[PDB]
Amino acid sequence: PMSIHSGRIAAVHNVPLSVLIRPLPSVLDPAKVQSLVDTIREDPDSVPPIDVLWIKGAQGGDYFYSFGGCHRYAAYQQLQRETIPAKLVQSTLSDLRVYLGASTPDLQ
Amino acid sequence: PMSIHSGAAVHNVPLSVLIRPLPSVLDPAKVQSLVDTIREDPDSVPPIDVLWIKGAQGGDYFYSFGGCHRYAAYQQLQRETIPAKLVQSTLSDLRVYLGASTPDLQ
Amino acid sequence: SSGNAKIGHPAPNFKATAVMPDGQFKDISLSDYKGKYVVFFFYPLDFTFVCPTEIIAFSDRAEEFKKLNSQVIGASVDSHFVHLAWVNTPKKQGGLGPMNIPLVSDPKRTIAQDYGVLKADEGISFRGLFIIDDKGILRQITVNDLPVGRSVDETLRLVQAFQFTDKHGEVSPAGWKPGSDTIKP
Amino acid sequence: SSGNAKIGHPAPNFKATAVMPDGQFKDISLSDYKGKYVVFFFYPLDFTFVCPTEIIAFSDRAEEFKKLNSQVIGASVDSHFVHLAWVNTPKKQGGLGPMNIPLVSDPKRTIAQDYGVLKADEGISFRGLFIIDDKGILRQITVNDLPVGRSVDETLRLVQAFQFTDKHGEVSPAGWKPGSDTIKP
Amino acid sequence: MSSGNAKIGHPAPNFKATAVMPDGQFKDISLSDYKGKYVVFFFYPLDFTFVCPTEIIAFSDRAEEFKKLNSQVIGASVDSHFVHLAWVNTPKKQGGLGPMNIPLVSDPKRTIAQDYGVLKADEGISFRGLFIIDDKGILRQITVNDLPVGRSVDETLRLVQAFQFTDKHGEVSPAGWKPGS
Amino acid sequence: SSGNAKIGHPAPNFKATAVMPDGQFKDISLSDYKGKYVVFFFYPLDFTFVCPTEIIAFSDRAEEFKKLNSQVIGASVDSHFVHLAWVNTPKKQGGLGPMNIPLVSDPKRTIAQDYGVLKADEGISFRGLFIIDDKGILRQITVNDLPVGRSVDETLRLVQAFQFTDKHGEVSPAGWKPGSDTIKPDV
């Protein structure tokens, strides 16, 4: 039914595509993109919300990182939608270092 | 509604060949509850995950560590077999469960 | 003693990423819990084939520890990502279900080694449990081989007993002195 | 681990003079008790001002351990002469009274050190308890700071649990195999 | 020098480890089990992260192309075999891996990661390391990427074909031919 | 790691005499190239009997690396005198021809040893390639046994990928926050 990153998290948000940071390049199979684009128009409630990491900088600045839902994100981008359904998971700057290594920025 | 230990073949494993070497602390409410769901709707209850381990001389052993409540339910209904998915495993996997109780399987 | 954990000396401090009961990741330290008794318990591995009834018992009865002004903390060598996945896997499918206790991640195996419960050959914790007082001093060491679990009742007995003795050390000098007037013939 | 005592490895052997329950002195070894489970427990000191109710509980309920084919053995750093004197001092006068368990004497403090329960600064054992299986393998480590005693019930729970798991490892090949004929549709 | 203990031209460090095979069973495998085959042995940091695991899936999906070249792809991380199995049996749709055509090696002691010189000490996890090992068990190629950048299946096939080409034109008999001056 | 070169730590600095593409000798350091990505690649030996197509590919396509604000640098244990002679020997006669990339000379074999690509027994570099970011941090290690060459395309893929991730770390706070107004209710 429900994601193993955000199962015991009630709140689904409408996150504007333009505030999600996606710093890892995607290898998208345009068959799976086109397929999801149709499932979004036909049956929105089919498509789970994406899992975004909510990380606070050293001065409390908010950053929203999307590392997953590569195909889902691409689909909502094609349909030039303003927002995507997402579950927010609060995380640390030390979690972010696992994903970005020496690309990890000094978040403020 | 399946399992993250055995996500193809489901077998009817005789309760009498399953080795359950870990004592079970069963909440008889949950047992009685499952006993009813087994009579009413068998396809509700997932199959249990049993480890199939070969001894040093190729002897077969079937270990059940999980489905503590499900096993107890089929035992109450004095059933001959339980639906189970088999996972082939090593003597070294078994040592994680049993420690110094791990037998020298032949 | 126990690898580095000595009864009566301060419990070895750890800093580690934990999965909190709300499903967030937080960076916690044992020292964060000064002022509370801590029941710190290791289990071998996430996602084994065993009904995790032991961990659930401690989660289920976490209220009884909060009542005694003590925090239960679980730990294994599995990543915080794995802890989260195990929590969000329902019991019905051999997961853990939601938790009322934080689960500490020890991937460098330094915490397991400090508490002397690292099984070297498999790279996993034994079933170790440690009671640590409000001042951060180690009071109790329990370590079981892998197949035998820990009792929530026996753990509460120990926490209440240590707290009892702790409390009857908040004492004022005696207003009273012996002498001729106090002797029984 | 615990000074030298490692879960899953053979419990450190001792040879020591004990006061047996008949009031004789015998030279016993842990290895003498292969074939039986052993509950080996340290206590700090003989002839302290504490009601020795913990030691007496284990002596009183020794029958329940014999029923489980296990031997309870007590130990402290006091000489065998002292153990004997403490036994032959009646409870009414702050002695121990007669015992159904042997009391091991560890005057060199080597046994306490091997089991990692020597409090260096005072030269006495912590409240350590060790469960050792019929093959002489250490299965359980319990160590309490001085003011908190051990439960006979929790000790029996552990011995029964280890014995349960021990017993369901005396297993023959299955005589059954899966295949087409065993599959559930 | 070299890579922690893995040296180009010397025999690749042997491991024995519990793996999750593609059939969903646990087997105890060794690198030495695969003498006679080329091995593409690749580490990834962690199971169950928030990243679409497209890199691992690419190698699984195109495993046929490696079998055609008489080579075995093997994945590895520091996660337990129990975790590997759980990640396989978690469907992609829920941020799992889905079923695999390649074995996944479990390195909980971090000895294998250390031998191949790809253990990130401070976090206790593998970098994105890939090693090509020939049919005689000799290390031929070292690839190690920082965490955010993945590996190409095509570039890996290019290397395996190239090493195999050169390997093959070294199965030679003395020349039946002589010059005259 | 690789002899002394560790992913995520600063790439080992070298100072060495190079033959620049203009045919002059310059004393360059890796640190001279902070602010640029560096593709630093070793090859075994100058003047071997192999068509040097690998080195030429990197020289020929140097424009594509300059476009990505990255410098390609070649290296071997041969003297700078030898590098120059190899450049000024035309391809037609088994030379290298003119180069758009500098060639570093490592006669003390210290640079090869620092990057962990010195084949001790022959005193020559393996086919090692290292990607180093604008801040001088090592991001990628490639080392091939002698008979197998490197792809310019795969090298560009890696440089673009590291640069992509580098760029999406120059970020301001979102100016969005979750709340009553952003919640998706049950449907």
Author numbering:
A (entry chain d): 30 to 137
B (entry chain a): 30 to 36, 39 to 137
C (entry chain A), D (entry chain B): 2 to 186
E (entry chain D): 1 to 181
F (entry chain C): 2 to 188
Paper's wording?
Peroxiredoxins (Prxs) are highly conserved and abundant enzymes with well-established function in protection against oxidative damage and emerging as regulators of metabolism, signaling, and DNA stability. These proteins all belong to the typical 2-Cys family of Prxs (also known as the Prx1 class) with a common mechanism of catalysis involving an intermolecular disulfide bond formation across an obligate homodimer. An equally important cellular process is the repair and reactivation of the hyperoxidized Prxs by Srx.
In order to determine the full decameric Prx-Srx complex, we generated the Prx1 C83V mutant, selected based on previous studies showing that the decamer of the homologous variant in the bacterial AhpC peroxiredoxin was stabilized. Two 341 kDa toroid-shaped decamers, each composed of five Prx dimers and ten Srx monomers, were within the asymmetric unit. The structure of the dimeric building unit of the Srx complex with the Prx1 decamer was similar to the structure with the Prx1 dimer previously solved, with the Srx molecules sandwiched between the active site surface of one Prx1 monomer and the C-terminal tail from the adjacent Prx1 monomer. The crystal structure of the decameric Srx-Prx1 complex revealed for the first time an intermolecular interface that increases the size of the binding pocket for the partially unfolded Prx active site loop, which contains the Cys sulfinic acid moiety and Phe50. Thus, the total contact to Srx encompasses ~2100 Å2 from three Prx molecules, which amounts to 28% of the total Srx surface.
